[PDB]
DNA sequence: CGCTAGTCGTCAT
DNA sequence: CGACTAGCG
């Protein structure tokens, strides 16, 4: 996520409802909804006892949309990614911690703290993602699991015309050039759009508006793919874009203590990590519900050695990819763990 | 002052 | 995933 991005693009959202794409299909960022919804089961979660509170809690949301005749596609989370890698490990850390404090803290009779902290050291499993998968299906709504990030698959989605609009928290979602996202969507139908077009209703964006220079604003400003260099966010990284008069980022990354005024140390590597990051934006792999293949985001440009980009994710055989997006196959063990068959979106 | 970095919350009785 | 804020320059 790009941290603050929406308060920062905030100009350029819109207060809708999504009656607005009744008989339009739209694509969901099912993790959120899978967080919320089990962080009100959170205790029986920690406990290891068994719960579908947060099966229920998708589900209004899904057919909320279907009651307005919108065609929801509930995409998932996949294999992990290795840039992002770092970022989950950190996620995973603090989620052992708030399980064992917790867990202090119902021998030290604090209950009230102890939820407080198991509300925070849940993990969305992906046995937890499958339940919601058959109860979704049982109302004939599709869903499909990305190879990886659920972020990329989406825009993809998106991009292909195969969507046309993304339900997501998540402001990421507009650096990999979705057309329309659409945040902070509650139970009602009542949320906030923001179009790709409708970008340079922000006058702080300047001419940074066009898809590869607002890319390139999001990444410097700090990212799961990359963090930042001291000192700098959205403000500065846009402001260096905008007096930024030459094509070549890596040269104007190069300068961009000339360009602030300031004395940055730039690392020889940030900006191999910078190449890395932007590369995972641009050509993470994803699955193609149509061809039934595994392919990156966007075609690689004759600028781009696909060898070196391993970091964006792994190709496997298709048939394989097919069996995951399906839901079929454990990401884990890469054992069947179900046996849907759409034959008898896709 | 604007801005970044780090801490806290998402459910729901 | 984000919102909020104390404190940084
Ligand atoms: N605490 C919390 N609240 C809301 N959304 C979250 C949270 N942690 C992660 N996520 C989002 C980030 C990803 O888009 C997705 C999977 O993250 P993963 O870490 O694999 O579960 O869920
Ligand atoms: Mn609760
Ligand atoms: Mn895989
Ligand atoms: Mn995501
Ligand atoms: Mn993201
Ligand atoms: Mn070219
Ligand atoms: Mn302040
Ligand atoms: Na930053």
């Given at each position: 996520?790009?941290?603050?991005?929406?308060?920062?693009?905030?100009?350029?959202s819109?207060?809708?409802?999504?009656?607005?794409?009744?008989?339009?299909?739209?694509?969901?960022?099912?993790?959120?909804?899978?967080?919320?919804?089990?962080?009100?089961?959170?205790?029986?979660?920690?406990?290891?006892?068994?719960?579908?509170?947060?099966?229920?809690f998708?589900?209004?949301?899904?057919?909320?949309?279907?009651?307005?005749?919108?065609?929801?596609?509930?995409?998932?989370?996949?294999?992990?990614?290795?840039?992002?890698?770092?970022?989950e490990?950190?996620?995973?850390?603090?989620?052992?911690?708030?399980?064992?404090?917790?867990k202090?803290?119902?021998?030290?009779?604090?209950?009230?703290?102890?939820?407080?902290?198991?509300?925070?050291?849940?993990?969305?499993?992906?046995?937890?993602?499958?339940?919601?998968?058959?109860?979704?299906?049982?109302?004939?709504?599709?869903?499909?699991?990305?190879?990886?990030?659920?972020?990329?698959?989406?825009?993809?989605?998106?991009?292909?015309?195969?969507?046309?609009?993304?339900?997501?928290?998540?402001?990421?979602?507009?650096?990999?050039?979705?057309?329309?996202?659409?945040?902070?969507?509650?139970?009602?139908?009542?949320?906030?759009?923001?179009?790709?077009?409708?970008?340079?209703?922000?006058?702080?964006?300047?001419?940074?508006?066009?898809?590869?220079?607002?890319?390139?604003?999001?990444?410097?400003?700090?990212?799961?793919?990359?963090?930042?260099?001291?000192?700098?966010?959205?403000?500065?990284?846009?402001?260096?874009?905008?007096?930024?008069?030459?094509?070549?980022?890596?040269?104007?990354?190069?300068?961009?203590?000339?360009?602030?005024?300031?004395?940055?140390?730039?690392?020889?590597?940030?900006?191999?990590?910078?190449?890395?990051?932007?590369?995972?934006?641009?050509?993470?792999?994803?699955?193609?519900?149509?061809?039934?293949?595994?392919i990156?985001?966007?075609?690689?440009?004759?600028?781009?050695?696909?060898?070196?980009?391993?970091?964006?994710?792994?190709?496997?055989?298709?048939?394989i990819?097919?069996?995951?997006?399906?839901?079929?196959?454990?990401?884990?063990?890469?054992?069947?763990?179900?046996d849907?068959?759409?034959?008898?979106?896709?």
């Amino acid at each position: 996520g790009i941290q603050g991005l929406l308060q920062f693009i905030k100009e350029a959202s819109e207060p809708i409802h999504v009656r607005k794409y009744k008989g339009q299909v739209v694509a969901v960022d099912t993790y959120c909804w899978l967080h919320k919804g089990a962080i009100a089961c959170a205790e029986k979660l920690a406990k290891g006892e068994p719960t579908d509170r947060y099966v229920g809690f998708c589900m209004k949301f899904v057919n909320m949309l279907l009651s307005h005749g919108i065609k929801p596609i509930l995409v998932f989370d996949g294999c992990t990614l290795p840039s992002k890698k770092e970022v989950e490990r950190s996620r995973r850390e603090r989620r052992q911690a708030n399980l064992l404090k917790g867990k202090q803290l119902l021998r030290e009779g604090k209950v009230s703290e102890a939820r407080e902290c198991f509300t925070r050291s849940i993990n969305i499993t992906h046995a937890m993602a499958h339940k919601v998968i058959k109860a979704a299906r049982s109302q004939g709504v599709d869903c499909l699991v990305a190879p990886y990030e659920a972020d990329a698959q989406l825009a993809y989605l998106n991009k292909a015309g195969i969507v046309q609009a993304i339900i997501t928290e998540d402001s990421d979602l507009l650096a990999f050039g979705c057309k329309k996202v659409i945040l902070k969507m509650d139970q009602f139908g009542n949320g906030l759009e923001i179009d790709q077009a409708r970008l340079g209703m922000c006058r702080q964006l300047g001419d940074v508006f066009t898809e590869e220079k607002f890319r390139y604003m999001c990444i410097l400003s700090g990212c799961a793919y990359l963090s930042s260099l001291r000192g700098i966010g959205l403000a500065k990284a846009c402001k260096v874009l905008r007096l930024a008069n030459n094509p070549d980022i890596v040269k104007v990354i190069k300068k961009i203590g000339h360009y602030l005024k300031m004395n940055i140390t730039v690392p020889e590597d940030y900006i191999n990590g910078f190449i890395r990051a932007n590369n995972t934006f641009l050509y993470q792999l994803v699955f193609d519900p149509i061809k039934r293949k595994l392919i990156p985001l966007n075609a690689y440009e004759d600028d781009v050695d696909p060898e070196t980009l391993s970091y964006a994710g792994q190709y496997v055989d298709d048939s394989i990819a097919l069996q995951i997006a399906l839901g079929n196959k454990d990401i884990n063990t890469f054992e069947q763990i179900d046996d849907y068959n759409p034959d008898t979106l896709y």
